[PDB]
Amino acid sequence: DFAKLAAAQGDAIDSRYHPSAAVRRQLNKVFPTHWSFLLGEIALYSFIILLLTGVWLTLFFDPSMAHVTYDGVYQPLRGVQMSRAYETALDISFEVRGGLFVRQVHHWAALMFAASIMVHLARIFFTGAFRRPREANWVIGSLLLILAMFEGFFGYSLPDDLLSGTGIRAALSGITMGIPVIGTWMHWALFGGDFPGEILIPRLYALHILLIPGIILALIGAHLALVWFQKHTQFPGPGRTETNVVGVRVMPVFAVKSGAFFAMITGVLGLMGGLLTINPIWNLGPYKPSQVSAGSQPDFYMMWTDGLIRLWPAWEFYPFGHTIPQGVWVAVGMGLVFALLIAYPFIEKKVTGDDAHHNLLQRPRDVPVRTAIGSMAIALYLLLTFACMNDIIALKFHISLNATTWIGRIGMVVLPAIVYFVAYRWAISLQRSDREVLEHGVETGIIKRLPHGAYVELHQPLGPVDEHGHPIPLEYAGAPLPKRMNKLGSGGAPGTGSFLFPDPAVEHEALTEAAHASEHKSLTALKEHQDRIHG
Amino acid sequence: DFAKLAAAQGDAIDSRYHPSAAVRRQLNKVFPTHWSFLLGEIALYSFIILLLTGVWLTLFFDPSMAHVTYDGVYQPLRGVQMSRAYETALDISFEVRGGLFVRQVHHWAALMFAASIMVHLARIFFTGAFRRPREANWVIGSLLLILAMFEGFFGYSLPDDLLSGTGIRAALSGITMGIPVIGTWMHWALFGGDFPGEILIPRLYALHILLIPGIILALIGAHLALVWFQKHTQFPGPGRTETNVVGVRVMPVFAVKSGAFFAMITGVLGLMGGLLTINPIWNLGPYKPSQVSAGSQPDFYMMWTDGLIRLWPAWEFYPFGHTIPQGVWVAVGMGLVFALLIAYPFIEKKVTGDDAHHNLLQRPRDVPVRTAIGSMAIALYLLLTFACMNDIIALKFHISLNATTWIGRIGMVVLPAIVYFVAYRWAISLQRSDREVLEHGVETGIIKRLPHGAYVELHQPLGPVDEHGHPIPLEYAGAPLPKRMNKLGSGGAPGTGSFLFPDPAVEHEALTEAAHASEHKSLTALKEHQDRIHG
Numbered sequence A, B: 001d002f003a004k005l006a007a008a009q010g011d012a013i014d015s016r017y018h019p020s021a022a023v024r025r026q027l028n029k030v031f032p033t034h035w036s037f038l039l040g041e042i043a044l045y046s047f048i049i050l051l052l053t054g055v056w057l058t059l060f061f062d063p064s065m066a067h068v069t070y071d072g073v074y075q076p077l078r079g080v081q082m083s084r085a086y087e088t089a090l091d092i093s094f095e096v097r098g099g100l101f102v103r104q105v106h107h108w109a110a111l112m113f114a115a116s117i118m119v120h121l122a123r124i125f126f127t128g129a130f131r132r133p134r135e136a137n138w139v140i141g142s143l144l145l146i147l148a149m150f151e152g153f154f155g156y157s158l159p160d161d162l163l164s165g166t167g168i169r170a171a172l173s174g175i176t177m178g179i180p181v182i183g184t185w186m187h188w189a190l191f192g193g194d195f196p197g198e199i200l201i202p203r204l205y206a207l208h209i210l211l212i213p214g215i216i217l218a219l220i221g222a223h224l225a226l227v228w229f230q231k232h233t234q235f236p237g238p239g240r241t242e243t244n245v246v247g248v249r250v251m252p253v254f255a256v257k258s259g260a261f262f263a264m265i266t267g268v269l270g271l272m273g274g275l276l277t278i279n280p281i282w283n284l285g286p287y288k289p290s291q292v293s294a295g296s297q298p299d300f301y302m303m304w305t306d307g308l309i310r311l312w313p314a315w316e317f318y319p320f321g322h323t324i325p326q327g328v329w330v331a332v333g334m335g336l337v338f339a340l341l342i343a344y345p346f347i348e349k350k351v352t353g354d355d356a357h358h359n360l361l362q363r364p365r366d367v368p369v370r371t372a373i374g375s376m377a378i379a380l381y382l383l384l385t386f387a388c389m390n391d392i393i394a395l396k397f398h399i400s401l402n403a404t405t406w407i408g409r410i411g412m413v414v415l416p417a418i419v420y421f422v423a424y425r426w427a428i429s430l431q432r433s434d435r436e437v438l439e440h441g442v443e444t445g446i447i448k449r450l451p452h453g454a455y456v457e458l459h460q461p462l463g464p465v466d467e468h469g470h471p472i473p474l475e476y477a478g479a480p481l482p483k484r485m486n487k488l489g490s491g492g493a494p495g496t497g498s499f500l501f502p503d504p505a506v507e508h509e510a511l512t513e514a515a516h517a518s519e520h521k522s523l524t525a526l527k528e529h530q531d532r533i534h535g
């Protein structure tokens, strides 16, 4: 009697505790059903998969520089001195059932985590979800992005590899020693000595499996709690206002679709871990200061920092008996990048004057200057990433390596400007298109007038039509406009039988008019609620 | 202008979010001011100290069996083959400033964590803080205690050491490998092969810094949330009923005293980390299977398991072509111990029959059978703990080792029974003392009656006095009774000047009169609230 068991368990729960009101509030919480609001969930799900795979990895990983000869199964690396970290990474890859798959899905989850964090940041920035109520949310999310970047750095640096080791040597060691007053001291504190200090990988292992994941988990908890209680913002729409949330309740629909989305994201990541090879360390010999490779790139989320290193033009200053190497330039650049990213909402409000409580998102077209600035920043980030990749770009796409370096150097001040101008004008022209639709109706096929030979596109008005043909223009309300009669009530009733065979006409008619009734009922309910809010 | 800044920040917080109601609820939440209710806070604070010191230790610890010759600073161990775990533990002790102190306070915090969990368990069990509500809280607390035990077990085993490695070889290897159907399979899957498998310490490091502490943190969060929202139970008292919480609000008093208690607990832990030596791994040479000491004990929380191993009388079974070693006996004993501890509230409710929602604790004397059972269990635990120490007990206190072993063997069935009987009768006699105090008043000095030589103790009634001398007996109300006029308004007003010199008579009179007025006001407030509730 599962129904009786459920009832008895509910009564016992509500007697021991009293979660009825709280649970009802959680279940009844309404979440907007916009697709772009799942971008953060992608990052959350990738993070969960990262935790689950990282536990498995830590069950088999040994962090240490203790030198050992492999003497494993992988023949191409036998008798070669390597760190125990590399040896156990190879053991995970080869000598544990499914360890290669687990580590590959872990790395793919890391890449998807960074990518989805970037996409979510783009969504919120361009939609203006950081304004008065949620600047703190933006700030903690920026800290979260920085932590994710650096944890991925430490994660692919954990198995001491040739690629990851040379990346560490460059970024960490060089840029740390570069810092003027405390650079060498920071280097010695972090590595416990010179660069190959025998505590580096244990320290990174701790930072990567316990410390940084703990901070990220706490910050994700704060992030999700803030989103939960500062009810999720929404785009302007029929019944959507600054003081309501139009969407679906948590329990019946949102919970089911979020769980299913998590399942599908897990499936995508597992499929990638299977079919796509990620970081094949066995091809990469154990780290040695002398051995190198041509590629020498970090993961894509640090590729922009590496590209900054490459592109910045070797400007070194030599104060009285001292040196200020080119690494400090990039250190300051990264500092500026993070500072501006964290402080943008406050910069935005200082610049514009907006101190209003904003609960309705802005369309990126509707906010041109911010959209232009975001496009400019994305262009700069892409230029830096492809500059880091300039080695492989030059190799495959036959471009001189010097040519790619200087393309990056010039474009990091030219391409941002071009993209800013283009994005600003593009946003304004999207606004112009929206107003054209508002004032003339949707466009359709052309018709030749009866008496004379005029051609008229035979538009379709979206609002009340004047006594004559031309309609009364509507007022823009911040919501997208249907520019195709495709997406309106036109040409949308295929035979509802099946792909290969029809259904009885009675069934088809019943279904089609039932759907018509349901959709017009939804439209009428939204219209009535909209009229009720002010009217 | 700190006041202006605070007001502006409060307005900003209440504009960005709306936490006024929730924050007021948290601040107004009332917590009983009983000392025994700080026992859980001791464990919580020790856990926090453990986390803070563990982060520092992970910054310097390298988990690996990779053999290395020390070549460090500690001369008595130079050129000796040791694992990287032992080498880096020695480095923490010697070649890192304050590292010895940090690891010592970490281990002392672990010991206090276990001890305070045990004391909190005693408090809740004896006061009945688990029945009907909070039974799941007790269950998760039992899981938490088990996790803490094994967490400390992996912790002091983390630096590969002679003592701790011998303890691992005994328990983790022998007990695991003796289990009949899957013993060797569990052993090989935990150790990645034979006992000295090259992954044991890395696996324990993962389990001990991330996995088990993560679960402990999650369960502590659940525990504290349950205590918070299932308002803390309280002892019977003047104004205390099953439907109210008499105490002090969170903000002014409870928060400050809890923070001060945290400060004092961490001060005790730091003082002991300094002044008392814990786990001198430098004295305890590196683990070698051929070497061993005579002590060979685990920390006091696993000492009862070790004592069970020692005392159990070498009963082995040999089925058809198989062996069932004595390790399975102790394994099943531990399983039974944990199962009974976890399932006691449900066992108690099944036995007695009480499923009523209990919010008022019951004094351990008021429940003779349960206090008797708890005393019996504590006696058995102490017997096992001292059996584990029988080696040093025999060495120092001159008692033959066989005599100590057999004293433990006989006592573990005799001592629990003796302690059960004694505790049962002691509880009933405490009840009898309470009743005699209720019906005769408190005792005082003796007086010789005027006409005849009668001697009468000259009691002092606690309630209304009959027309004649003897008082109207009161009814027991589940709350402690004052058995000394000492603790009542009798001889308690010393000159309020100072230790060395007096104060002016006017000031002393003002102070004492104000104090007496405050006592009257408090007692009258309690009395009036009690009357209002029960009338």
Ligand SMILES: CC(C)=CCC/C(C)=C/CC/C(C)=C/CC/C(C)=C/CC/C(C)=C/CC/C(C)=C/CC/C(C)=C/CC/C(C)=C/CC/C(C)=C/CC1=C(C)C(=O)c2ccccc2C1=O
Pocket (backbone or CB within 6 Å): A383, A386, A387, A388, A389, A390, A392, A393, A396, A397, A399, A403, A404, A405, A407, A408
């Ligand atoms: C710092 C910086 C950006 C310096 C400049 C270097 C650079 C990126 C130059 C452009 C590269 C191109 C497009 C070369 C083709 C020749 C060329 C320049 C033609 C004119 C360009 C132009 C305006 C054309 C008009 C039409 C048009 C837009 C054509 C674009 C054609 C292309 C290539 C579109 C896709 C863009 C693309 C993928 C560029 C390469 C970028 C990267 C990082 C590829 C990474 C990558 C590599 C390198 C693999 O080898 C590989 C092997 C197996 C599986 C996966 C991959 C993989 O993902």
Ligand SMILES: CC(C)=CCC/C(C)=C/CC/C(C)=C/CC/C(C)=C/CC/C(C)=C\CC/C(C)=C/CC/C(C)=C/CC/C(C)=C/CC/C(C)=C/CC1=C(C)C(=O)c2ccccc2C1=O
Pocket (backbone or CB within 6 Å): B118, B119, B121, B122, B125, B126, B145, B300, B303, B304, B336, B337, B338, B340, B341, B344, B373, B374, B375, B376, B377, B378, B380, B381, B382, B385
């Ligand atoms: C223990 C209890 C209340 C049980 C309830 C009944 C029940 C549900 C039993 C279920 C399971 C079974 C089979 C239990 C029997 C054996 C048993 C308890 C096994 C599990 C052991 C375990 C994980 C926890 C038991 C914890 C417990 C409550 C211990 C007593 C601790 C308390 C409250 C002591 C009094 C507080 C106080 C002021 C202490 C300081 C004074 C001193 C020094 C007391 C004596 C003392 C103690 C207590 C040491 O632990 C110790 C350890 C190492 C060296 C020396 C000593 C020592 O001298």
Ligand SMILES: CC(C)=CCC/C(C)=C\CC/C(C)=C/CC/C(C)=C/CC/C(C)=C/CC/C(C)=C/CC/C(C)=C/CC/C(C)=C/CC/C(C)=C\CC1=C(C)C(=O)c2ccccc2C1=O
Pocket (backbone or CB within 6 Å): B041, B049, B052, B053, B054, B056, B098, B101, B102, B105, B224, B225, B227, B228, B255, B256, B257, B258, B259, B260, B262, B263, B266
């Ligand atoms: C060589 C070397 C490395 C040396 C250092 C050693 C090392 C590695 C680490 C230790 C170093 C440190 C940082 C030590 C200090 C630790 C620390 C934070 C101490 C704080 C205590 C302190 C300084 C008090 C000052 C006096 C004062 C004005 C106190 C009032 C204001 C304060 C501080 C209030 C704090 C309140 C407090 C304890 C909050 C804890 C937060 C948590 C985790 C839970 C809150 C909480 C509590 C506390 C409950 O009791 C409770 C009971 C029932 C249900 C729920 C709860 C609940 O949720």
Ligand SMILES: CCCCCCCC/C=C\CCCCCCCC(=O)OC[C@H](COP(=O)(O)OCCN)OC(=O)CCCCCCCCCCCCCCC
Pocket (backbone or CB within 6 Å): B340, B344, B347, B350, B351, B352, B353, B373, B376, B377, B380, B416
């Ligand atoms: C260190 C020490 C070891 C650790 C100690 C902790 C373990 C729990 C402690 C004790 C359990 C045994 C209690 C005593 C059980 C009483 C037996 C009885 O005869 O039943 C009478 C009851 C009163 O009913 P009544 O209407 O008040 O009538 C008055 C009649 N004269 O009946 C009932 O409801 C209940 C009947 C069935 C009870 C079954 C309880 C045990 C369940 C299995 C769990 C394992 C138990 C392990 C035992 C160590």
Ligand code: HEM
Pocket (backbone or CB within 6 Å): A047, A050, A051, A053, A054, A055, A056, A057, A058, A061, A089, A092, A103, A104, A106, A107, A109, A110, A111, A113, A148, A151, A152, A154, A155, A156, A157, A158, A159, A208, A209, A210, A213, A216, A278, A279, B210
């Ligand atoms: C939270 C975000 C995280 C990110 C972005 C991340 C990223 C990465 C990446 C990219 C790798 C390289 C894997 C490879 O080269 O095969 C890695 C390795 C590793 N990760 Fe993480 N990780 C995260 C969380 C965790 C957690 C929570 C744990 C532990 C529970 C963990 C444990 C490990 C271990 C042990 C390795 C080394 C395994 C190997 O070398 O193959 N990671 N991490």
Ligand code: HEM
Pocket (backbone or CB within 6 Å): A210, B047, B050, B051, B053, B054, B055, B057, B058, B061, B089, B092, B103, B104, B106, B107, B110, B111, B113, B148, B151, B152, B154, B155, B156, B157, B158, B159, B208, B209, B213, B216, B279
């Ligand atoms: C949760 C309860 C915990 C308990 C009961 C506990 C217990 C212990 C004990 C007794 C030791 C032995 C120290 C020594 O012999 O000097 C130890 C070592 C260690 N603990 Fe924990 N610990 C806990 C949590 C943690 C946490 C959260 C971390 C990391 C943040 C951590 C990290 C370490 C490290 C790295 C060592 C090795 C230190 C050494 O070898 O000297 N522990 N632990």
